[model samples]
Target: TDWLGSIVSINCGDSLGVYQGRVSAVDQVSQTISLTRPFHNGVKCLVPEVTFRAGDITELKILEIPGPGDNQ
Candidate 1:
């Protein structure tokens, strides 16, 4: 998704939960994103990360800009 290192807010379908994190990796073929320091339900998860598939996301908002390698 070329959004690595970008911070994003994601709504994981209905009112299930909303998460925020920094993009760690993106797999286009699988349509998934791995997030670092992921926060769920407005609280940082016990684990350091999480991954969400595209179909599971109802909305996504980028809170940071440019992303990794944007100027490189």
Candidate 2:
């Protein structure tokens, strides 16, 4: 469950929408991951500095993993 520092994409059900961003925080109790630079519904969020939760995600994917020297 340690997904921090990785790039991830999530399909957050129909209404809630989809998103992708770097894993910024993870809350085990809430079953959510806070993503920085979050994208919504395939489009980047207008707010450049933002975070979104994936609690209701229908699908989740690890798009890219941070390399050893990478600071994701």
Candidate 3:
């Protein structure tokens, strides 16, 4: 499946909190996922992107696959 530009939800380990973001990258070999324009519990983050290792992820869910404006 195409993961690029998809909106995703990630539950991080140990109270790092849930994050929602637009998918930027996914590395199968390294088991990492990257996101741009991330939100932590609805609040925008300072960083442009965040990369999560498989070890840091408690859960992950797909919200939407963007197309056109699609609230990019």
Candidate 4:
């Protein structure tokens, strides 16, 4: 998955939980990826970045903010 430069949410197993951020880098050989401006468990984190291991990831999703609906 070429997620570089796209917003993404990675759901990791166990205590790792879910994280959202812009995909910054991927190290497929190591089965890992880095995220910039990460949010953990739906809350923004203080750190500038974080990386998740593929083995710990249960699911990954590319994210897009929904456009304003006409039925406001």
Best by TM-score: 1
- Count clashing pairs, candidate 4: 0
Off by over 4 Å in 3: 66-72
Ranking under TM-score, best-scoring first? 1, 3, 4, 2
- Residues 1-72, model 4: lDDT tens digits: 465667788998777788998877778788888888899966889898898888888998979532343211
Q: Candidate order by lDDT, highest to lowest?
A: 1, 3, 4, 2
TM-score of each: 0.82, 0.72, 0.78, 0.77
Model 3: per-residue Cα lDDT over 6-70, one tens digit each: 89999997769888998888788898888898999679999989998868988889898666653
Q: Count the backbone clashes (under 3 Å) in each candidate.
A: 0, 0, 0, 0
Give a tens-digit lDDT track for model 1, residues 40-71.
87788998978899899999899996444652
Which 10-residue span in candidate 3 carries the lowest summed lDDT?
Answer: 63-72
- In model 4, where do residues sit more than 4 Å from their true spots? 65-72
Residue 45 C-alpha lDDT in model 4: 90
How far residue 9's Cα lies from its native spot in candidate 4, in Å, is 0.6
> How many angstroms is residue 34 displaced in model 3 relative to the true structure, after the best TM-score fit?
0.4
Give the Cα-based TM-score of candidate 2 against the true structure: 0.72
